[PDB]
């Protein structure tokens, strides 16, 4: 979403989000750090290819051709510099000149020392309560973004972790068609299409980086949850990790865990989809969670089996037509969970990543809310670990990731909504250890 210095009347009217870095001659003198060698303001590269006919409302939705409905000028950073104003480094690099390589290791949450488990839980809690130093979130769509008097940008500060929740919400929300009109819901810029794995990869990378700067710990890494154990239970739902079941309410988190104190954002869909507003930073109810608790649906009362992971890593084409939730023999769709681990599509199956979500029977099972439950982080670093092993094994074969006719948001060169600066799926479609400064300490079934 947008840097606070671009969430201004001047910046939105200009269409330029190219903030200063260290201006020593007055405002606008070091845009993108162009005084040093760090970058320059330039025109936005956005995808103009066609999308699937599934979305019929071209011209109605601020997320189309991201980010041109807000800005047509951005920073492009030189070399291994990065960031909204080219003041930081690309993933895997540090130092004033972005020339010292780092490689952080993402580990199984269960393998961490007692002090590392407690350090991770507290870091997450700190992110829930700490204002994001860079990004603010829109509470209204572009037509109303400048406020009633036209001079009051409709943005709020938001914590580090709630920003992580908000961008996921924004990527899946419905297209508002107007008061009286029913919002359009056959659209999802981060699921049910090829961009699912690259989108969620950046999502994790952005939270990880934000927590490193919040902690001043360059090497801090996000753990993962191996949910492919075939278990009846959630083995990370203990009070030293993520929280156990409350004994006073089967659907709440134990009061002995800090997560029972969390209050969710973005749980007012009926307001957003009838008044055309957006999720803001005001929190509401508690996390609801009830592992295996969906008696109405026995298929989602057990977690994937270890053999589900091995099977899906044998699917060698990243994605297949129609590049949607009903694709067959698509690794993307298999690991996402709409096909079975062998690639066979079945409207009645949920497996792997989808199954782990549904197994929570709660806040984590609803796509517009699920990052509110911090299991989401661990569930998706695991999905990313699977994705990374695929990248290794099939040599990052981006060839079946379609350039056009995907569901909207999912063309290969689409800028992943709503990340800032603009970042394509392509930039994420690389093996992490050589290209993104992280790797997984994990071994696969065989
Ligand atoms: C690049 O953007 C400028 C600024 O326009 C804004 O960009 C988007 C947020 C979009 O929502 C526009 O409505 C915003 O106005 C464009 O310059 C303006 O263009 C509009 C009509 O397009 C015109 O009425 C204004 O007079 C222009 N204002 C200024 C300060 O020039 C510019 O045309 C865009 N260039 C592109 C898209 O190639
Ligand atoms: C954002 O937070 C700043 C402090 O970082 C505070 O001064 C202000 O209330 C907020 N500004 C906007 C535009 O939301
Ligand atoms: C934030 O969202 C809630 C729920 O829709 C809403 O009632 C409230 O008015 C919103 N706040 C702002 C400032 O729009
Ligand atoms: C949880 O499962 C029950 C049935 O056992 C179902 O009625 C309810 O909708 C589910 N809730 C969520 C959030 O999945
Ligand atoms: C997948 O779903 C779309 C939209 O419902 C449909 O047009 C397409 O034919 C489906 N493909 C299948 C079921 O193979
Ligand atoms: N919608 C999916 C389940 N699901 C729920 C929450 C999510 O975040 C997600 O990514 C997927 C399904 O129908 O199986
Ligand atoms: Zn350039
Ligand atoms: Zn998701
Ligand atoms: Zn998910």
From Swiss-Prot:
Alphabetically, which GO biological process terms does the record hold? acetoacetic acid metabolic process; melanin biosynthetic process; melanocyte differentiation; melanosome organization; positive regulation of melanin biosynthetic process
List of glycosylated residues = 72, 80, 157, 280, 326, 361
A GO molecular function term, named singly, is: oxidoreductase activity
Cofactor note as given? Contains bound zinc ions after heterologous expression in insect cells, giving rise to a protein that lacks DHICA oxidase activity.
Q: What is its EC number?
A: 1.14.18.-
Which residues does the entry place in the Lumenal, melanosome compartment? 1-446
Q: How does it sit in the membrane?
A: Single-pass type I membrane protein
For this UniProt entry, what's an example GO CC term? melanosome
Regulation of its activity:
The activity depends critically on the nature of the bound metal ion. Catalyzes the oxidation of 5,6-dihydroxyindole-2-carboxylic acid (DHICA) in the presence of bound Cu(2+) ions, but lacks activity in the presence of bound Zn(2+) ions.
Which modifications occur after translation, per UniProt?
Glycosylated.
What is the similarity comment for this entry? Belongs to the tyrosinase family.
Q: Which disorder does the record name?
A: Albinism, oculocutaneous, 3: An autosomal recessive disorder in which the biosynthesis of melanin pigment is reduced in skin, hair, and eyes. Tyrosinase activity is normal and patients have only moderate reduction of pigment. The eyes present red reflex on transillumination of the iris, dilution of color of iris, nystagmus and strabismus. Darker-skinned individuals have bright copper-red coloration of the skin and hair.
Report the protein's function: Plays a role in melanin biosynthesis. Catalyzes the oxidation of 5,6-dihydroxyindole-2-carboxylic acid (DHICA) into indole-5,6-quinone-2-carboxylic acid in the presence of bound Cu(2+) ions, but not in the presence of Zn(2+). May regulate or influence the type of melanin synthesized. Also to a lower extent, capable of hydroxylating tyrosine and producing melanin.
Q: What is this protein called?
A: 5,6-dihydroxyindole-2-carboxylic acid oxidase
Lineage, uppermost ranks: Eukaryota, Metazoa, Chordata, Craniata, Vertebrata
Which part of the full protein does this chain span, and how long is the full protein? 25 to 470 of 537
